[PDB]
Write a protein that binds this ligand. Sequence first.
Ligand SMILES: COc1ccc(-n2nc(C(N)=O)c3c2C(=O)N(c2ccc(N4CCCCC4=O)cc2)CC3)cc1
Length: 115
Amino acid sequence: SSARIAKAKKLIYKLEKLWNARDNDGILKLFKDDAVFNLNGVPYKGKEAIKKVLESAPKAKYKITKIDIKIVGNEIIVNVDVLATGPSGFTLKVKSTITFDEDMKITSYEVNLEG
Ligand SMILES: COc1ccc(-n2nc(C(N)=O)c3c2C(=O)N(c2ccc(N4CCCCC4=O)cc2)CC3)cc1
């Protein structure tokens, strides 16, 4: 249970590298096959749907600035404050809520782009 908190912290920084590397194949492997990707209010359920959003994600570099890990039941809730940089230098304070289960696989992944 304590290792799960540490595993979650490492998987967040791993996700940051995969996102900036556009390793969409690797990103999916941490996802449960029936996970939900809530992209600013629009949920995308299923590996095939989460995928299509990954390769359609805009060209952007991400830097983690704050990580909060909460435990609710048997699920690891990770709230990540991210700064997303576009090629034009446009910077947006985005927020992500990632949920892990016992298998350390992502069950829910919500990206908030409003602020
Ligand atoms: C320049 O400003 C922007 C604005 C919007 C967008 N934008 N567009 C989409 C889309 N229309 O698909 C998505 C994003 C985004 O910001 N996404 C993301 C959010 C957060 C993370 N990170 C960082 C690593 C660890 C935690 C974590 O969750 C990784 C990717 C994916 C989706 C980009 C740039």
